[PDB]
C-alpha cells in the first residue's frame, strides 16, 4: 500500500497497442503522485472527468484501470464521454458517468515511419456502436450492402481494420499519439 504505482511501465512502455485492441493494466494497492503528471509539459492532453485534475492526490478508490492505445491527434478529442466518431463509436467508448482522466502525448518519433507505419490499425466499420469499455478484435468482412459477402472482399464488402500509415512528414493532426485512460472504480 505504501509502494509506488507502476505508472512508469505504463506511460513509458516500449510499444503501445492499436486502438481497436486497446490494452488494460489493472492497478491497485499503490500510491502515486499525480501532481508531476499534471505538471508535465510532456503530456499534450490531461483532462479529467468527475474528479478535479488539480486535486487528484487527495482521493482514494478501490481499483485503478490504465487503458492505453494509439490514435492520431485529430481523434484524441473522441477519447471523452459523450463523443462520437470513428474511435468513439468503433474502437474505444467511454461512459457518460466516466470517473477518471484522459492523458495523451505526441508519439511521432516512436510510431511514425518514413513511407508509413503498418502496425497501428483502427476499426473503420461496425454494425452497431460499442458499449462503454467494450473490446472488438474480430476480422469479419463488413457487409455494407444487402448482398452477403462470403469471406471475399469487394463492392460493399470491406475489411474492417485499416492501417493508420503514420508518416513523420504528416500534419501533426495525423501524427501518432499515445493515449492513457485512467479510471477509478
Amino acid at each position, epitope marked *: 500500500h505504501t509502494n509506488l504505482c507502476p505508472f512508469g511501465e505504463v506511460f513509458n512502455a516500449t510499444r503501445f497497442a492499436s486502438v481497436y485492441a486497446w490494452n488494460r493494466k489493472r492497478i491497485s494497492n499503490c500510491v502515486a503522485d499525480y501532481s508531476v503528471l499534471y505538471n508535465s509539459a510532456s503530456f499534450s492532453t490531461f483532462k479529467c472527468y468527475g474528479v478535479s485534475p488539480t486535486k487528484l492526490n487527495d482521493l482514494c478508490f478501490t481499483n485503478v484501470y490504465a487503458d492505453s492505445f494509439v490514435i492520431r491527434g485529430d481523434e484524441v478529442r473522441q477519447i471523452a464521454p459523450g463523443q462520437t466518431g470513428k474511435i468513439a463509436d468503433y474502437n474505444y467508448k467511454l461512459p457518460d458517468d466516466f470517473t477518471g482522466c484522459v492523458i495523451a502525448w505526441n508519439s511521432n518519433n516512436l510510431d511514425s515511419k518514413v513511407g508509413g507505419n503498418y502496425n497501428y490499425r483502427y476499426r*473503420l*466499420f461496425r*454494425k452497431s456502436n460499442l458499449k462503454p469499455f467494450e473490446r472488438d478484435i474480430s476480422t469479419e468482412i463488413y457487409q*455494407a*450492402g*444487402s*448482398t452477403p459477402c462470403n469471406g471475399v472482399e*469487394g*463492392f*460493399n464488402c*470491406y*475489411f474492417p481494420l*485499416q492501417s493508420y500509415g503514420f508518416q513523420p512528414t504528416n500534419g501533426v493532426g495525423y501524427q501518432p499519439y499515445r493515449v492513457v485512460v485512467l479510471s477509478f472504480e
Partner: antibody, heavy 123, light 109 residues
Framework: QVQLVQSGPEVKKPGTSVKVSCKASGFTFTTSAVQWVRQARGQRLEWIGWIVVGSGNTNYAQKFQERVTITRDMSTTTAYMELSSLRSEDTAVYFC????????????????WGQGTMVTVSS | DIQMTQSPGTLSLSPGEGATLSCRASQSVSSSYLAWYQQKPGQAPRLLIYGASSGATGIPDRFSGSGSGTDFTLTISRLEPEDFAVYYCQQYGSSPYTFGQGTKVEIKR
C-alpha cells in the same frame, strides 16, 4: 437531393496532367465508393478504376495503371481522378459514380452519377 | 479481366414492340453484381437494373432483368418513345468492373 457534381470542362496540352473533381452531397460520403468511367465521343463506357472512401484503397484497370491515380478527401466530401501524361487519345468525357449510403449501409449498385467532365488534349 | 459483350449492336424496333437486350460475361459472374444502364445522347448513364433482376428506384415496371452466370437479359415489355437510347451492362463484383460495348435501341421506320 442525393447528388454528384463534377468539374467543369478541361482543355490541356499534350503531356500535361488533368485532375477532375467529384463532390458528393445528400448521402454520407464516408461509407461509399467512387468509380471512374470515361467515354470517347461516340464510343462505349470505359471503366478506369474505383476507390473506397473510408479506406482510400484503389483498384485500377490495366490500361490506366500507368497514368491514373484516384484519391478522395473526406473533409471536402470530394473524390479526385488525376491523369498524367495526357495525349490526344485521352480526349473523352469522364464520369464518376457512387452508391448512396447512410451511416452503416449502402445501395447495391452505382445509382448516383456525375454530370460528366469533358477533357480535350491537343496542341 | 472478365469480358462483357452485348447484342445487338443496334436494335431497330417500332414504338410499342417489346425489346430484348443481351449481356454476356466471359466467365460466370454473380447475379448480385450485374447492372443495366440507360444513356441518352449528351447525358450521363442512368441505372435501370441491378442485381440482375432488381429494378432501380424510379424505374418503371416495364423494365425487367433476368439471367445467371454468363448470360443476362434486359427486357422492355412495351417500348415507349423515351426508351430509345443506348443501354450498357456492367459487372461490378470482380475487379476490374468491365462494361459491355452498348446496344442502341432505335425506332424502326
Amino acid at each position: 437531393q442525393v447528388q454528384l457534381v463534377q468539374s467543369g470542362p478541361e482543355v490541356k496540352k499534350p503531356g500535361t496532367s488533368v485532375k477532375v473533381s467529384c463532390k458528393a452531397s445528400g448521402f454520407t460520403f464516408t461509407t461509399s465508393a467512387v468509380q471512374w468511367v470515361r467515354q470517347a465521343r461516340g464510343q462505349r463506357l470505359e471503366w478506369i478504376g474505383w476507390i473506397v472512401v473510408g479506406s482510400g484503397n484503389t483498384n485500377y484497370a490495366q490500361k490506366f495503371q500507368e497514368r491514373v491515380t484516384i484519391t478522395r478527401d473526406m473533409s471536402t466530401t470530394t473524390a479526385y481522378m488525376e491523369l498524367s501524361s495526357l495525349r490526344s487519345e485521352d480526349t473523352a468525357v469522364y464520369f464518376c459514380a457512387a452508391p448512396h449510403c447512410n451511416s452503416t449501409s449502402c445501395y447495391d449498385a452505382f445509382d448516383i452519377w456525375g454530370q460528366g467532365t469533358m477533357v480535350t488534349v491537343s496542341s | 479481366d472478365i469480358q462483357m459483350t452485348q447484342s445487338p449492336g443496334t436494335l431497330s424496333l417500332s414504338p410499342g414492340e417489346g425489346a430484348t437486350l443481351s449481356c454476356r460475361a466471359s466467365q460466370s459472374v454473380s447475379s448480385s453484381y450485374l447492372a443495366w444502364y440507360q444513356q441518352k445522347p449528351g447525358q450521363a448513364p442512368r441505372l435501370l437494373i441491378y442485381g440482375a433482376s432488381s429494378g432501380a428506384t424510379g424505374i418503371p415496371d416495364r423494365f425487367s432483368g433476368s439471367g445467371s452466370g454468363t448470360d443476362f437479359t434486359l427486357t422492355i415489355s412495351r417500348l415507349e418513345p423515351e426508351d430509345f437510347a443506348v443501354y450498357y451492362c456492367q459487372q461490378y463484383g470482380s475487379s476490374p468492373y468491365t462494361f459491355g460495348q452498348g446496344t442502341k435501341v432505335e425506332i424502326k421506320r
